Write a structure and sequence with these properties.
part of a larger assembly, 5 chains, A mainly alpha (43), B alpha+beta (78), D alpha+beta (518), B: 78 residues, alpha+beta, two-stranded antiparallel ribbon, 31% helix, elongated, D: 518 residues, GROEL, domain 1, GROEL, domain 2, GroEL, seven-stranded mixed β-sheet, three-stranded antiparallel β-sheet, binds adenosine-5'-diphosphate, binds beryllium trifluoride ion, binds magnesium ion, chaperone, chaperonin, nano cage
């Protein structure tokens, strides 16, 4: 099986990838505000 | 205190976010700004301030809260 | 678990550091469920 | 010598065909990933509002995205039509719609065959694909036992491609129970779909009775037991007046006081006229004025306000009551009754859940989940399920899905081509080729060699094993009857019908003319 | 996170395939009418100079018209190459070039086969197409009688698709005689082509001297 089945379109592969990143960033903005040694944010 | 760069991952609207040190210092600097204005006006040896409406019209006072009310304060921590 | 007062490895149930089962039962279920609906996505297109 | 006004576009024959094709194929090639079990969802987002939606329902994608290409806007509509006429098959319609036109460009260019002659061939194939559909149709007779296990399948098949894939068995029984409970009624208003955020997806349920997005008349008892219900449309807060123009002209203030208490008396009497009904539960579409709200409380009658033409109609079907006005002669109108109306909590909001009703002919399904989009989709996914199953109460024949249905037509259309002959013959075979291109993408989204698998399933169905379908987890040819992948005949009959029409409309097109935009 | 500078375009896999095909096909399809006897001529015109030219030579079209699609410009050059190495087969190269690429997209999409596997398959075929070509080849020996009549033919064939189709025979002997005359030199400076406006086309000649 060297020929195999070729995955044609690539937007999927890169959209998932770029969504996770876009999401992990929000979860990252919050990390400072967890637990008793957590800090508040002014909006 | 070089103007901070907007992150390349996070996506916020008509809005900017400064974190950790940059804000902690901004707060303190804006807090001294408001406080240092009225440190001249403390004590019997303290003096009074002259506050112009911009149309000439003005008020002269010591009463700290009346000075701080009049000054246009832009910062939250201020 | 971590106790802030002790700064290290200490028995947290006895340390009186306690959180409801629901706060963790729902915590994982929602996250794991959300991930499922984030991974469904294979394209974004802008609508009217 | 110019003819038209300015900013006017004239795309003629050679170029008009380009728009027609490129437009359809573009739309088809947009929803191709929606099709099938191991199919994926799109994320639509408007520039207005900052809103979005995470969807599969092919219609919801096409109906949303803006488009310029008229040939595309044609297929967009045929997608709405299918959602109106069947509820499911939105994506299938469009893909088969495009793949027919894809196979037309390939004939118009590569072969040089007149479009009217491809039309006059597509037509011969379409009446033969619809032919062998009815012949392969499995109508289910009196055995409602055999027909229930049949309907559940329909749902299981419809649902696997949406988020509800993992929870198919659970949601299938929720849909099947709801439609069978609907007692034949083909109106979906009767099933209230209340989505409340939180918990799992397995946590969604159909209530045995009805849950109402309303409250009790004030400090009234929270849970009524052994209910009896009057359902009403009459005015309360507005204060019933004889329409015309009843203006009071009081000579001196003294008569105003009396006429003020008079309006109060007109109410007290209109509640006493109701009191005579002998009923502990009063539900009314209109508002209950701050006054009547108390008059019911002192009497012990529970009073619910604001449940519109919608809410009232369902309550009348679930409680077996009547949408009553007048209230002058209680003997002639029919009351509603149920067992218990206790006010439950669901995450935050207080709902009054009618439980143990007289006739289940109207229901409420409560959907649950972790995300507002997840809920959005569950409702949209569910509507697709409460459509096929509701329309198979009217159209009770079944056809085996999993590509099987479309293959059996690909068979007959392909043998009728060995019968027709000429230059039309090619367009007849092409129709069959386009029908094949559906199981092809069902296989392409899952991941296995589209070429090999479709080519393996062709052989079987053509060889006379007209049950053979696609096992889209195991990548094999599997018996569709024995694996319960069943679909509505009315579905498949619409898909081919609708698509064949799209084809002829567009294939007739040879001149696209656009006027200066407003 | 943006990588490149501005005005920079990134056409990756799924979109880079489109360009490569759209380009080739769009160019192949442009000259398709040139091919063969009952083939037609294009009228090219510059923005510059108020100049134009009515042509068949498929290179002369491709060389001239402007293009952006890099894949197209690839085929455009393969056109000049042919005009360099052989002089004829300009349009025959481009069409066969595009028709291969058309046939690839139909494999890459409809079937879903790997491009590199298509390559390792287009390769085996090419070596076999060139194979039989030499087996079917008709080499003409010492019989210069049998070879001149043979040459006159090649021209008659080449010529039929240009304005010179009607006076094929005439122009065929004007070429055959000129090249034989050239005595086996392969430089064409030795034949000065002087075009003087006027008269019939059948009025054209190779001077004795
Ligand atoms: N479990 C399954 N296994 C194999 N094929 C399935 C399964 N469920 C559905 N299908 C097939 O996939 C198609 C449903 O795809 P879907 O994305 O729901 O399209 P549509 O929106 O047009 O209904 C049906 O034609 C059916 O034959
Ligand atoms: N009189 C003719 N009868 C049949 N085929 C011809 C004739 N003349 C040319 N051809 C064929 O047509 C092609 C030549 O067409 P042409 O437009 O000159 O393309 P190119 O510039 O690539 O040579 C060759 O493939 C040749 O076999
Ligand atoms: F994309 Be569908 F209506 F199952
Ligand atoms: F159109 Be060619 F170079 F014979
Ligand atoms: Mg030639």
């Amino acid at each position: 099986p060297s020929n195999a089945t070729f995955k044609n379109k690539e937007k999927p592969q890169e959209v998932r990838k770029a969504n996770i990143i876009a999401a992990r960033s929000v979860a990252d903005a919050i990390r400072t505000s967890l637990g008793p040694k957590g800090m508040d944010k002014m909006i | 205190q070089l103007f901070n760069n907007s992150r390349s991952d996070t996506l916020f609207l008509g809005g900017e976010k400064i974190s950790g040190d940059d804000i902690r210092n901004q707060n303190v600097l804006a807090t001294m700004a408001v406080a240092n204005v009225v440190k001249s006006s403390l004590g019997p040896v303290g003096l009074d301030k002259m506050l112009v409406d911009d149309i000439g019209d003005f008020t002269v006072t010591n009463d700290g809260a009346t000075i701080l009310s009049l000054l246009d304060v832009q910062h939250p921590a201020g | 678990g971590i106790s802030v007062r002790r700064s290290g490895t200490t028995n947290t149930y006895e340390e009186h550091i306690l959180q409801p089962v629901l706060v963790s039962t729902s915590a994982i279920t929602l996250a794991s469920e959300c991930v499922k609906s984030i991974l469904r996505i294979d394209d974004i297109a802008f609508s009217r | 010598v110019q003819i038209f006004g300015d900013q006017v576009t004239e795309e003629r024959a050679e170029n008009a065909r380009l728009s027609a094709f490129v437009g359809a194929i573009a739309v088809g090639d947009l929803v191709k990933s929606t099709l099938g079990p191991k199919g994926m969802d799109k994320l639509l987002q408007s520039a207005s509002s900052n809103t979005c939606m995470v969807t599969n329902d092919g219609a919801t994608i096409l109906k949303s995205i803006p488009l310029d290409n008229p040939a595309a806007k044609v297929l967009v509509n045929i997608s709405k039509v299918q959602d109106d006429e069947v509820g499911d098959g939105t994506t299938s319609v469009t893909v088969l719609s495009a793949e027919l036109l894809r196979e037309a460009e390939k004939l118009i260019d590569q072969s040089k065959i007149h479009p009217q002659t491809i039309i006059e061939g597509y037509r011969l194939a379409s009446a033969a694909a619809l032919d062998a559909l009815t012949k392969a149709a499995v109508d289910n007779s009196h055995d409602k036992t055999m027909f229930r296990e049949d309907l559940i399948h329909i749902a299981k098949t419809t649902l696997s491609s949406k988020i509800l894939s993992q929870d198919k068995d659970h949601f299938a029984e929720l849909a099947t129970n709801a439609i069978l409970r609907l007692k034949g009624s083909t109106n979906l208003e009767h099933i209230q779909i209340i989505k409340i955020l939180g918990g799992k997806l397995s946590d969604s349920f159909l209530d045995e009775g009805f849950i109402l997005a309303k409250k009790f008349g004030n400090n009234q008892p929270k849970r009524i037991e052994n209910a009896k219900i009057l359902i009403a449309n009459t005015t309360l807060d507005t204060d019933k007046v004889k329409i015309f123009g009843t203006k009071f002209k009081v000579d001196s203030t003294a008569k105003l006081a009396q006429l003020e208490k008079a309006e109060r008396e007109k109410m007290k009497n209109k509640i006493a006229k109701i009191s005579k009904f002998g009923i502990n539960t009063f539900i009314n579409r209109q508002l209950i004025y701050d006054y009547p709200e108390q008059l019911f409380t002192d009497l012990g009658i529970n009073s619910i306000e604001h449940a519109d033409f919608e809410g009232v109609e369902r309550l009348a079907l679930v409680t077996g009551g009547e949408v009553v006005s007048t209230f002058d002669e209680p003997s002639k109108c029919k009351l509603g009754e149920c067992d218990v109306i206790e006010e439950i909590m669901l995450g935050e909001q207080p709902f009054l859940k009618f439980s143990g009703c007289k006739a289940g002919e109207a229901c409420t399904i409560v959907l649950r989940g972790a995300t507002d989009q997840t809920l959005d989709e569950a409702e949209r996914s569910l509507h697709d399920a409460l459509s096929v199953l509701s329309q198979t109460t009217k159209e009770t024949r079944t056809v085996l899905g999993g590509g099987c249905a479309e293959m059996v037509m690909s068979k007959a259309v392909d043998t009728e081509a060995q019968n027709i002959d000429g230059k039309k013959s090619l367009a007849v075979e092409a129709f069959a080729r386009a029908l094949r291109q559906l199981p092809t993408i069902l296989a392409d989204n899952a991941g296995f060699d589209s070429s090999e698998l479709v080519s393996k399933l062709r052989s079987s169905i053509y060889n006379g094993i007209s049950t053979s379908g696609l096992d889209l987890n195991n990548g094999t040819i599997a018996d569709m009857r024995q694996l319960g992948i069943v679909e509505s005949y009315k579905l498949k009959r619409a898909v081919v019908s609708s698509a064949s029409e799209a084809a002829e409309v567009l294939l007739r097109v040879d001149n696209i003319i656009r006027a200066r935009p407003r």
